[PDB]
Amino acid sequence: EETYTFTIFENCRVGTTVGQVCATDKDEPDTMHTRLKYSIIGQVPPSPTLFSMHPTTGVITTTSSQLDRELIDKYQLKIKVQDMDGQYFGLQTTSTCIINIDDVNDHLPTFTRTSYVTSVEENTVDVEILRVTVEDKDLVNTANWRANYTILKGNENGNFKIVTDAKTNEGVLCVVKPLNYEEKQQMILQIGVVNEAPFSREASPRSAMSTATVTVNV
């Protein structure tokens, strides 16, 4: 190819494979002047070195300690292939490799506040009672930055729903089935937020999930 293009995850282990580059010669084979030798000849950013390439098969693997989507998203390298085993009078040819970085769900939805107090009238539906919000440092609009909420406590007979207002990821709490002041005057609640995306390293079950305390007055 004129230009090779690959895509790797962020914050995966060093030594991960990028992709392979492939070239050929039309001289007589098993000679020296067909013996191929491949290389990186430059990076953006210029230093330090983040990738390495296999000299006799053209396979690129990662050599930095980290490649992190939430700071850098792309790396364009200049690459070359030489015959003669890379002896000084072999013939050589320059080309380009683009590496992309792909966002994993490494970051959490993060509160600026975790306790909240509200009131509502009895008998009422289609009224909202509490909004909550989050940052997530994953990339906008992706499944990794999108939000989902849950009512964890205090909704015994089904008065409450939580839904997401997408444009800011704001979790909107509403009464779906009415209260009755002639049964209860106060209740205490818990909610929670997590991504639409899965999480790793045993985070799925609760530790990806963040919670807020709620009180509702009738």
Added chain:
Amino acid sequence: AWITAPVALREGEDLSKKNPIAKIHSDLAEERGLKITYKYTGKGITEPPFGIFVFNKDTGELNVTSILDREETPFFLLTGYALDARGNNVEKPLELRIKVLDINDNEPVFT
């Protein structure tokens, strides 16, 4: 070279309780103002048998992946190394040697 002491591993048991069974360490910050990266090679890691030992490039800690037998794999020879944060020579290398420790699990056989 020198007859430096081995790290030991006993037959047929799950050897991942000792991991990391060795480590390299060095630092560069106060004499040179740099940070570090570490490497191994040798039998188990770049000569056969393959995939026996593994180490993180940031840390220098070495693990063993396999259940072993001195009746199959009597001794292992590695060398650690360390380089600076651009790839430079900084510190002398050394060897590291591993043995299999042997218990009576087998009966004598003719030649």
